[PDB]
Amino acid sequence: RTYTLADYLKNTFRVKSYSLRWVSDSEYLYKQENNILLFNAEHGNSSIFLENSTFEIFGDSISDYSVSPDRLFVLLEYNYVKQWRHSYTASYSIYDLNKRQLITEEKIPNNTQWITWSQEGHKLAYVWKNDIYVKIEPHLPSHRITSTGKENVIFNGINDWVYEEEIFGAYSALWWSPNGTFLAYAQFNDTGVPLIEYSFYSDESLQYPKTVWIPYPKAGAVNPTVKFFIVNTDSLSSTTTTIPMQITAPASVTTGDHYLCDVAWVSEDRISLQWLRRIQNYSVMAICDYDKTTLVWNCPTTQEHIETSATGWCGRFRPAEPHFTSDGSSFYKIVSDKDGYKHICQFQKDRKPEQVCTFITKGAWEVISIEALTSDYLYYISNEYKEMPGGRNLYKIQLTDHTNKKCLSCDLNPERCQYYSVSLSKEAKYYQLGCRGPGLPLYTLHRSTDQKELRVLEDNSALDKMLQDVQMPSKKLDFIVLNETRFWYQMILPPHFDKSKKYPLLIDVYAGPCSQKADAAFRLNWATYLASTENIIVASFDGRGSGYQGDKIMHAINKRLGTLEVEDQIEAARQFLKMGFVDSKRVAIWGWSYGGYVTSMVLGSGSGVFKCGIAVAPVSRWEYYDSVYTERYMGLPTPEDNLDHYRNSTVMSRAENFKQVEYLLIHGTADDNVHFQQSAQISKALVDAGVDFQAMWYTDEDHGIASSTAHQHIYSHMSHFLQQCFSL
């Protein structure tokens, strides 16, 4: 009995997790048998919040619910239709809990792009046909905040293709005030950003394919422009015209092209805005105070703090999140230290010249995230324990005595759990811990003051008993040392793995900037089929360019994508070959996104190591991928700065060297991210070079190739490919 392709694809072994939503400092909403229940952590009791029958009034069309902080009204979301990675339109209707009836008067319009409640109370703000509206109460008629909205040209409250994807990780660009006085939001102008057109074939019944278009900026092209406003919603009236107020950007960033990259209310009358230059090695933070007398927002340069980078770019993917103290007088942030390691730093609102910040943590390891901030303490995920970059543990530093640094999750189950996450309550009195590997995931309820386990939310005992009689793979997380530096790797070893045998090897690569494909988390996936059922070892290596091990490693591939990380993969495979248990004749490399680009570049290096490989949705040329991401690591593609390196690092130029390998190129026709064009060009270059390869398009699939039937088909197609490449 082995974990089969069928098992992966049909989800027979289900890895359960525990989703809860904190609604107060002692209570969370959890879902059970489709009923929303309310559990109080302070006592032991559970009540019923919303019964499944109320969802069933809309049959099975409900995709989500969302409750008002005060608990009087619920947004039932139905008719979800996806757009991009985060974006979608949906219809909403407000269920009034007290009354137990749908609010049928002045209803939320259909095709609504983004709706969210205020942080307190029950005020609504929505985005519809690109304009922001706001309802003070559910029954009241809506108030139109902006009217500049146009399809694909002007976006208010919602994000552009590239802002969504690359800076915010969300369709939302509107943020409510802490007590609901103001509604901050960003506006993006897309006039002049060139369009990526592609064919959409749809159903059999559609006689003529439809051309889909998106304003999408590529390396060097005309980017979008941004404007940040704030509007007062307490003065919302049909009698008086609503005036939004425009906070303008810093002088430092307005000189050339720039991005808005963070929005963070600190208090009622203060909001922080980080902006970033288009080069991305310089970033400015602007703390902006509200002047009540003349209703303008002022951003002093005494209040402007600048983080920059000489070694590469700012942040993992952008400047880190500001966590401000209760009085707004100081704030905490993950910033890069003297030796390159990113740690927590304490700033002040005012910017004394000599001193940027005070580093409260330090060492050869990185703070992954700041999780909560009390007056007494700060909680944070870090990878310090046991010098394992791909490990995560909860820590708690006391604001007063930084000597008082306590690791809350390190030794609870040291064998089962080396990768934790956490979700703390409104004022942090309680928290849920989620161990995500290397054992079966375990979610448990704890009290903050002294870590005492109050409950066990989910221990995956069901999956455990299902997997007890299955021959699963092992997982070796360890390292090899090249040039006096440790570069970690993970290997999904087959069941009953013996060092006296020679197994085939598959390298699963991503290898992008700030990537980590070797860590302690637990995954049931294609690799586990490949190890258990096929006896393929699947290894992944985090060489240069990988994150969480100091900037010296991460910025090592700066201005030079397709070089040091590409050869580091090739080198790793050599290092594993030296370990002796790998057959040199059967070594493979596969990957998706950046991984696909890396696999294509490794296959074309002429190294002689790798025999075959599969690129899925790959990048071929860096001038095709979007500006915000591409330019973060390469600069512009112009002679003034780095055009040669865009030219040096294309898959196309290495087509001659594909004559030594077996290549399987795959791409979805309706990919809006890494457009099909990129694979269309790789194929054209291989054909011109007289190279036989294999290919598979996927009609109407995006970057995910996520559709249930297409998903089953890609992984079955690739499995058969590897089956032939390794002679079974």
């Epitope: 029958s53 009034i57 809309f58 049959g59 099975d60 069309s61 137990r100 009836q101």
Partner: antibody, heavy 110, light 89 residues
């Protein structure tokens, strides 16, 4: 499980008629009505959740088909209002568990 | 607002094409004078009281109902989108 629907009724211009599903043999406590016109397909009117008074209706069956339930009596009531020629139809009741699990025998309102 | 259109109006096999993607499709068999009974749900599951010859298949817009080895007015309805809607017959 069976639902002995009320006998057929005759109605004329301007008037309002009430109809009873009379569910039995199952743990009552969702119920929906579909209007079927003769020679044509089925069309969904609305839903009542019998435990509470919670009602959801179709677009523009506001006014028509006021759906209310009082649990004590083993039944559900659909009041169609201001009937015209179009409102003359078969009107079934149903029980909703995953889809339309069981159906009432119909009233031929005229 | 979703429109189910059934091709044939006739192993005979009727189809349903939906105007948009439905998660699951339900089927109801009817005869003249008599209230309809549940025949198929969750795309392919045979409802109780229905002979084993019957099948269901297809995901997205194109669903299909396959009566194996036909022997002696089937409607198709969806509730993945609101409001719920029925096929012609």
């Amino acid at each position: 499980f069976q639902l002995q629907q009320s006998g057929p009724e005759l109605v004329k211009p301007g008037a309002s008629v009430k109809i009873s599903c009379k569910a039995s043999g199952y743990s009552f406590t969702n119920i929906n009505w579909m209007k079927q016109s003769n020679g044509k397909s089925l069309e969904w009117i609305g839903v009542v959740i019998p435990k509470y008074g919670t009602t959801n209706y179709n677009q523009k069956f506001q006014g028509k088909a006021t759906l209310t339930v009082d649990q004590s009596s083993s039944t559900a009531y659909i009041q169609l209002n201001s009937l015209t020629s179009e409102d003359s139809a078969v009107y079934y009741c149903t029980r909703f568990r995953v889809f339309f699990d069981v159906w009432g025998t119909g009233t031929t309102v005229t | 607002q979703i429109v189910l259109s059934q091709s044939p109006a006739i192993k005979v096999t009727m189809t349903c094409r939906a105007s948009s993607s439905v998660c699951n499709m339900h089927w109801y068999q009817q005869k003249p004078g008599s209230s309809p009974k549940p025949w198929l749900h969750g795309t392919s599951n045979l409802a109780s009281g229905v002979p084993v010859r019957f099948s269901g298949s297809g995901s997205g817009t194109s669903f299909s109902l396959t009566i194996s080895r036909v022997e002696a007015t089937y409607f198709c309805q969806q509730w993945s989108n609101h409001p719920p809607t029925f096929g012609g017959g």
